[PDB]
Amino acid sequence: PNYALKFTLAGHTKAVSSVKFSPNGEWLASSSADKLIKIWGAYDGKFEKTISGHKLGISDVAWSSDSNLLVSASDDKTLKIWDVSSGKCLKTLKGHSNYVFCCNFNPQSNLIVSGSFDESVRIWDVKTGKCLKTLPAHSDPVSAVHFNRDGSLIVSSSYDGLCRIWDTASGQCLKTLIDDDNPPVSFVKFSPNGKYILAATLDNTLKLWDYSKGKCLKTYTGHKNEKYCIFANFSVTGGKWIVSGSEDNLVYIWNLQTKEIVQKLQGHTDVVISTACHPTENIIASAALENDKTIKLWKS
């Protein structure tokens, strides 16, 4: 465990919100809220092209199989259906009335969910884009949408710790999960099997929650997450690894069985908004907000 700095991805006008790697080692664009998506690289920061022309800042952008097809979850209550080599507004998604926080293409590449805050969540079509359903996704605003390994389950996060695994074919979720905290959950996600969900309970104790029982496996220590948005990552390249984001200008990389403090990596100048992981190689990015305006690549 000697993960060393390799590159630096600067050149931002506003704060960077997210990094999300390509599924097979292709790209990592500037998924920020700066009205800019510059197609940066994952291996060496290879600048490809400029895809911009937005009205407001993008909360997060989606991703595709070829890491090209996008849809903008911007803050102007609209969504364009994007392509890299087009630069053209195909259609417009309408049905929100607040911040479009999050949107996803499923791993089968045939759905466009779009998360909202006043529960105007609509699951859209990739081809047509017709108004289908308002969803009562929580009692609270949504802070995560995700699709599992195959694409029949939708996890969603709340401001009181609702791990609702929404069904794709029917629309009725199965199991309600809870903690004794009152957690404003910034992010939940699936696993490579869909059974363990890492929520956000904000007293420096983030828990990996089971599918059926709703218990936790191993409650980690030594991390800093009480107010700010921090993603949730795992690594399958070599052995067991735990990678997350930080707040105190560090890079959080640990192991699952230990629950210790064995590696933290200085090098940032802001609260780490985002880290991410790569399946075959230990190529790890680490993004931060406006007081850094860089995305620093890491590699063993």
Partner 1 sequence: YPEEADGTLDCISMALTCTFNRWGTLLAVGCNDGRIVIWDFLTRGIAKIISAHIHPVCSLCWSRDGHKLVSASTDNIVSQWDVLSGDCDQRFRFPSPILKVQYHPRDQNKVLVCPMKSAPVMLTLSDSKHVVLPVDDDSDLNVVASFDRRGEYIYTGNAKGKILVLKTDSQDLVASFRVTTGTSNTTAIKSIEFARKGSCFLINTADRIIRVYDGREILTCGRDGEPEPMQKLQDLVNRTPWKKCCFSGDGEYIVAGSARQHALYIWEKSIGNLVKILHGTRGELLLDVAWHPVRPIIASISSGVVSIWAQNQVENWSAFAPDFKELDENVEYEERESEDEEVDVTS
Partner 2 sequence: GSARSEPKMSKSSQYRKMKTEWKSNVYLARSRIQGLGLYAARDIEKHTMVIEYIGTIIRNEVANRKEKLYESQNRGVYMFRMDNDHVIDATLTGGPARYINHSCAPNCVAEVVTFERGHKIIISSSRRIQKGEELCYDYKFIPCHCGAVNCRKWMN
Q: Answer with the entry of partner 1, partner 2, none that 118 interacts with (C-beta below 5 to 8 A by kind).
A: partner 2
Q: Report in angstroms how near the CB of residue 182 gets to partner 1 at its nearest.
A: 16
Among 256, 292, 299, 254, CA closest to 274: 292
Question: Binding partner of residue 290 among partner 1, partner 2, none, CB under 5 to 8 Å per kind?
Answer: partner 2
Q: Is the CB of 59 or the CB of 114 nearer to partner 1?
A: 114
Residues at the contact surface with partner 1, assessed by CB under 8 A:
125, 127-128, 130, 132, 162, 164, 166, 168-176, 191-193, 195-196, 208, 215-219, 234, 236, 240, 256-257
Partner that binds at residue 56, options partner 2, partner 1, none, CB closer than 5 to 8 Å by kind: partner 2
Name the minimum Å distance from CB 19 to partner 2. 13
DSSP 198-231: E---TTT---EEESSS--BS----S---SSS---
Q: Tokens 């802070």 map to which residue?
A: 143
| 132 interface partner picked from partner 1, partner 2, none, CB below 5 to 8 A per type | partner 1
Nearer to partner 2, 68 or 114 (CB): 114
For 70, the 3-state DSSP assignment is strand
Q: Note the residues at the interface with partner 2 (CB under 8 A).
A: 14-15, 17-18, 33, 56-57, 59-60, 75, 97, 99, 101, 118-119, 134, 136, 138-139, 159-161, 178-182, 184, 186, 227-229, 273, 289-290
* Long-range contact pairs involving 69-77 (C-beta distance under 8 Å, separation at least 24): 69/105, 70/37, 71/103, 71/105, 71/112, 71/114, 72/100, 72/103, 73/100, 73/101, 73/102, 73/103, 73/114, 73/115, 74/100, 75/33, 75/99, 75/100
